[PDB]
Symmetry: D4
Subunit: 207 residues, 8 copies
């Protein structure tokens, strides 16, 4: 019945069964460099106002119930800036998350009247929802996640279905849903190119 | 006879020579598609001959060429297709598909150099020499010169061979799947450029 | 009698008849790239403390009463940074707005003691009028403009006659009215050069 | 006899040769008008001959030249008039009008190159070769050398022909009206430079 | 008896006679480019807590009582960033102000523990005096200077003797008084080089 | 019994005897350029909540009790950004401080989820301790240090043992203690290379 | 006979030639170790001969080479060891120690020049000429060419001599102790690069 | 006989040749005075001959040279004295005064060029050719080579003549008083550099 369902290592089968459709997802790590900074938390939400928070142990390389969800082509995974998380999940578990919807790419493609494409600003404008970023820069490898860390992790996925729905309607209205879908199809490759060593260059540029 | 010249569109007879992949480049009045009109489209089937099609100011149709560009059964090979795909969509409304880009391929496998232009690729990969002297000529000239026609043909005459060599390197070095995904995105990348995202990576934060 | 007169598609003939002289004008769009971001609103004021707000539909390419006002050489159009709006109006309707007075160019030419040439700062110093920029970055394509969007649109044109008058007096006092008038005569060409593809370069520079 | 040399001002007799447009350039002690004085003004009527006028330190009048510069009935042709118009206004108080600038014209039509200098324009458009060797000489020298006089004349001898070729390109490519509006603004752009706006586009936000 | 003695055109002989020693001085203009932006106000203080504020008219090229003070080698002129004001005064009146003490140069040479060398920060640290910069960016050519403009002009010179005295003691303590004096001797040339056309380059650099 | 024990010139033998293990240490100077800006204060703490504050006189080149502590290989010296202080101490006294632990290097090596590696931010996150930076940019050469300067100097060393202990545990947890120890072994050379003339280049780069 | 070629690992017999310091360089597919695989390791004992070891894709062991790299009794000499030490650790898991880097040495003593590459060092310090023509070749080629083998050997043949000359300069100019401390840190600097600190000095504020 | 070589200090006999202005330059181990020691001081009286003084590591005195440098009755001529004045103060504690700097003079009068180095000044102003080949040599060498001695002498042999030509231009173009004030500040500018203000103009806001 909990708003924040906590797991160690992997999601339970009962909680994975809550996800009959799209899966909202984010991760927390020790930093922005996957080969240096380990995966610490994976958080998920089915869009019903509750979330799963999964603590990932140091050195952990399998999470079979979660990994099946990530690879399942029948269920879309929704991220805000999936470029990073898709890379972290491939680096850690060897899974290519697919198919994906990225609300940051979607924001860039339809919220053409602003330069503010972060999650907090998207949720404020599109949903009139306030989230706090205070815990983004904390030690996510802690043995005991703090109440504030659990709040942040859950709130970071609780609103992604609703945000995707609003941005999808804007993309359809403004004629860019096809462009968005092509971006989402390339996103796992973009993440893998980062891991391989092209993380600071646009492969489509001249240089 | 190795450079077949056409006004406006390739003939149906010459289009029928293209039984497989189509090497393609364009020439324009500059690097800004909405400012700098398409002036030439050049094609080769990889048999050592080329078709050079001169495009008129204001021309909006080229039915035989457009059918080739849209034909999903025949790959189109470009060097830096990001630009030409945008120009072709801007001019004719056609989305060229499917594509292979030898510049993207070069960037993904020739990791030991920063020289990814066509001339350098042709020299290293094929020992073929081309001259870039006519690159900055007036492609809207009333009469294209013999030097211009030779330059335009040379930009397409070797793309099948270059594609094959770079594909072998992509296989050897493990990046053929990444290259194919880049090629699948390339028409969208070109369309995003036309809409004013030309100086930003849509996959970056900004 | 309304302070904010609302129109769909075009201004009414009765309201266009209010403009016996200069026309204060601005636009709202989906962003700063005319070939990508459609025109959404045109707002006008005759300088009497009231404004016309005209919602422009997606795909709309004619607005005959408005376009006649924009092209009428007998009535000056007053913009703050007309470089953008003149381009948007030419892109959308094919009209070359003329003649124009730009209060941003005027500010740059006479308010030589400051680097703050935006509308809010000009209105504060020159008129002791406060305006809020909160709604500048909103979805101007909304089917129902919000009360805050209507306030912003109206306030954005309500003070331009008064601002033009103050800046004109400063330009005369400080000896730069001729320079300003030459800038205003070039402004439609500058806007058209942006649309053609020179939007990021000064055509008068070496490169 | 093809380079007519004058001290201070052109003679009335030689000014009367100019029945139409006046090609014009200047030489100075550098690129900062309030620091670097005007040293030479060079003119050509487009007939293959030039007038070279040497300007003295502190000279504030040149009545025959100033009458030509202000005469609204005769166009003045410059390559990058933005600079010379400023120098002439700073020195003599004259606003040169009306003007044609071949550098603005080049930027508006030679969209396929970044080379908009005079030497490159003359080579592409006219197959005329000029040498820039004396560009960085001391133009305030007590005696101008034959090389300096040849350089100064060559900067004006071809501007009518270059104007005509670039005008044809502006017609072909649809930008003659934009060019004319730029020329109408150019004297104001030059005056804004003298006032300290030389490093900013007055039409930008900043 | 006034704290702020106002003058039009030139200081009176009676008020110039108050200055038996160093003269604290600043100017106000229409901006930072002397050939474009006219001199509007010259303000002076003898260090006794009162100031002279002299309005300079458009086109005015003489101010004989003031100019004698500026040129008088027997009385030091104290500026905060005299590089600018010395240039403006030479451009306007043809006078080379000498000798000078610049409290900004002095601050840079002895307040080596901070990057904040403006007047407000110097007065706060060295004298525990607060001044407001609100009126720095105002129209100084106004026919009627506002009460706030008069306050700003006076406060800008009221504390310069005291600031010079504190910074002089620091320069002596820390061994850099000779360097400071050499900088002050070069300052009029530095100002003149700005007017001539070297305003954006250090003449002592390679380029 | 004092929380802040004050010394002129050198620490007393009795107070040096308090340091049976690691020595927390910082300095204050007239600025960031050792050849220009003299050493003014050395502050130490044994980690018991009290500190020694030693005023260094102008021109002073010996401090034998302090220098013995700095050179003693049996006692670690703990700095936050020791690169600077190690250089200042070598420049002033000729002593090579060794061995060292730098909490800024340690922070950069383990607090990989943040870009905020200053002392104030480290103490806030790692210890929930607040310090004020108000007095960092003050005149540290004053004959009479102010109460606020004494507070700042003491608080700057009071928490370094505790910070070192927390960061050491993080470095061990995250696998980078060996990297940190190698950085600390190079740190005196890095400081000396700064003094010699390589202060603006990484000697390990290509250029 | 002066270039001994090996597949995969140096032979035990040839490793036994190395009684003292070991000059070493590598060749790769580019400058990003996790992207661009190790292709060649080249060694010299300083006797005018070299061992060139070609490394296979996916190769993770080279026992004789790794024993040399880890042997604390024999110094390894590199020019810009920061890169090669990282590549060797990434590929084989070995931490090369102890090391001398002639590029660090050059930066610490050749204070009158910005030219710290190997070719310039060899020319000034030894009057030895090497050519960099094969620097940007495909080092993963199925067969390394004679030019590639000569280039690879020349990169190690002179490092003992260069080390000796630069050591003399470090003694003369007072920086040998600083150099030795840099060499002691160099393996850590290389490991920090692999972890993503490659564009930051860990000793700076940021 | 035209290059008189000295160890440590000029002889009293050769110092007595200098009855007027003293042309002077130095050579060092690089551009950072506290890192890169003074190695050579070269002087000329303007008579076509030079004194070259080799400076030892750690040398802190040179009494005859220092007396010349401090002598207020004899001007010292440098090209970019900002550097050498700092090196001489750092090494010997002497404040060289009074000075003329031909690089400052060049910047104040050769307003039509960005080429203010010595070689370019000597070529334009005197038609004298010097070669910069030894600029980046090891000036702390145990034996200075004939090429080094020729380079060092050539840096001072023409400074009187260059000073005279640039002074004439400063007179012509109205900036001799500004130049003299710059020269009066130059020793302070050099001392501020040594104190860490070397990358900032003390007269700027920051």
């Amino acid at each position: 019945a909990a708003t924040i369902r906590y797991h160690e290592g992997d999601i339970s089968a009962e909680d994975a069964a809550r996800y009959k459709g799209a899966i909202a997802i984010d991760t927390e790590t020790l930093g922005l460099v996957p080969r240096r900074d380990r995966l610490c938390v994976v958080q998920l939400s089915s869009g019903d106002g509750t979330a799963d928070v999964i603590r990932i142990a140091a050195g952990q390389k399998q999470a079979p119930n979660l990994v099946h969800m990530l690879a399942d082509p029948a269920r879309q995974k929704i991220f805000h800036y999936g470029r990073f998380d898709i890379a972290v999940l491939f680096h850690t578990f060897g899974v290519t998350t697919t198919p994906v919807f990225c609300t940051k790419i979607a924001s860039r493609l339809c919220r053409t009247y602003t330069d503010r494409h972060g999650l907090k600003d998207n949720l404020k404008e599109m949903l009139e929802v306030d989230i706090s970023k205070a815990q983004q820069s904390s030690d996510w490898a802690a043995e005991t996640l703090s109440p504030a860390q659990l709040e942040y992790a859950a709130s970071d996925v609780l609103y992604l279905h609703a945000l995707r729905d609003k941005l999808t309607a804007r993309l359809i209205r403004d004629g860019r849903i096809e462009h968005a879908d092509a971006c989402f199809a390339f996103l796992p490759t973009r993440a893998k190119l980062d891991l391989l060593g092209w993380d600071e260059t646009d492969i489509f540029a001249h240089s």
